[PDB]
Amino acid sequence: NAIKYLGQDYEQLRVRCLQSGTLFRDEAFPPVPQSLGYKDLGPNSSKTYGIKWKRPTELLSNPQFIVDGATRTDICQGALGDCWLLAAIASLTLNDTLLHRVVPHGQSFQNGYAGIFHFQLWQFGEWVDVVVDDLLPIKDGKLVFVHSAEGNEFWSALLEKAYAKVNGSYEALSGGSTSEAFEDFTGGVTEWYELRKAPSDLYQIILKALERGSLLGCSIDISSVLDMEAITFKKLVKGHAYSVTGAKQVNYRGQVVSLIRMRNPWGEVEWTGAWSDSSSEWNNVDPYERDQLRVKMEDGEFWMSFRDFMREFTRLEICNL
Numbered sequence: 001n002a003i004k005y006l007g008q009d010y011e012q013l014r015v016r017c018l019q020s021g022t023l024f025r026d027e028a029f030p031p032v033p034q035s036l037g038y039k040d041l042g043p044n045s046s047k048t049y050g051i052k053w054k055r056p057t058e059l060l061s062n063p064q065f066i067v068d069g070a071t072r073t074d075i076c077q078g079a080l081g082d083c084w085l086l087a088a089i090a091s092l093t094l095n096d097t098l099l100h101r102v103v104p105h106g107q108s109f110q111n112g113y114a115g116i117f118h119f120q121l122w123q124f125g126e127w128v129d130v131v132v133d134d135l136l137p138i139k140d141g142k143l144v145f146v147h148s149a150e151g152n153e154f155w156s157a158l159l160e161k162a163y164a165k166v167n168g169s170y171e172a173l174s175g176g177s178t179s180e181a182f183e184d185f186t187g188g189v190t191e192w193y194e195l196r197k198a199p200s201d202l203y204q205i206i207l208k209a210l211e212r213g214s215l216l217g218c219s220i221d222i223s224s225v226l227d228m229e230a231i232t233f234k235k236l237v238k239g240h241a242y243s244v245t246g247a248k249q250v251n252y253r254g255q256v257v258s259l260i261r262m263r264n265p266w267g268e269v270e271w272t273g274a275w276s277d278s279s280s281e282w283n284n285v286d287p288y289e290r291d292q293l294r295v296k297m298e299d300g301e302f303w304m305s306f307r308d309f310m311r312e313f314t315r316l317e318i319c320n321l
């Protein structure tokens with residue numbers, strides 16, 4: 001069982017509020033400017049213009065914690081540089097057991113709701129249970145930071161808030177290592193690969209890791225300094241954390257091709273090359289595999305041949321449990 005972060009007891013607080021007919025207000029991470037940031041998101045920064053704090057129950061009639069499952073498409077980056085964290089959460093959703101530990105399912109905005117939620121995070125050698133009240137940064141009636149493709153789903157926004165909490169603020173989440181989040185969601189350890197000097201069996205390593213439920217991420221190195229999140233001509237993003245969400249060898253024109261699937265945590269802007277959603281490669285793949293693997297949707301997720309992946313990406317991270 002997880003340790004209580006800052007001694008905060010989710011069940012107790014929830015019961016206490018539920019009994020007092022009140023909603024939880026987190027003293028350890030209040031809906032104040034400091035919780036948003038200190039510099040670019042500081043009290044006197046224009047980026048915080050119009051940002052207010054509101055509970056989902058104050059925005060919609062029936063907000064939901066989880067809708068159609070807690071999946072990777074529920075992770076769509078907002079106005080914050082926490083791609084590393086979001087790619088980790090999206091990868092986390094693929095390991096059903098760990099996902100259910102980090103994200104306690106069964107939390108709802110209906111039965112037993114008292115404006116409080118909790119999440120488990122592995123922090124400095126131990127699993128800790130972190131609580132947050134459900135006040136979230138909103139602007140123009142929309143979540144400012146992470147949001148699900150589904151506007152009425154809030155589990156991911158709440159998880160990001162809990163992660164911001166352990167970091168002192170949302171701004172503190174700007175800039176980071178996907179490896180760190182992978183480990184904080186698993187208690188596992190990340191091994192990194194320099195794709196230009198990778199094992200001949202790297203694809204097999206990726207296959208086995210995905211099957212085991214390890215978390216995988218990848219990125220393109222940025223040596224141009226300020227080309228951070230620069231979109232390439234083929235619509236890959238540099239200095240940006242991607243979730244490696246799949247890998248399968250497919251029967252193509254009667255042959256076998258090694259593909260890798262990844263997801264841009266933005267939830268949009270996808271590779272336009274071979275194997276992308278509407279690419280012609282799919283016309284010559286087995287009708288069943290095409291149906292199982294290819295989804296024509298601007299959801300940030302797409303396939304690439306392993307060769308193109310090795311040619312376009314510079315690093316791969318595998319966090320094994």
Ligand SMILES: [Ca+2]
Binds near residue numbers: 069153
């Ligand atoms: Ca969902």
Ligand SMILES: [Ca+2]
Binds near residue numbers: 270277295298299300
């Ligand atoms: Ca897609």
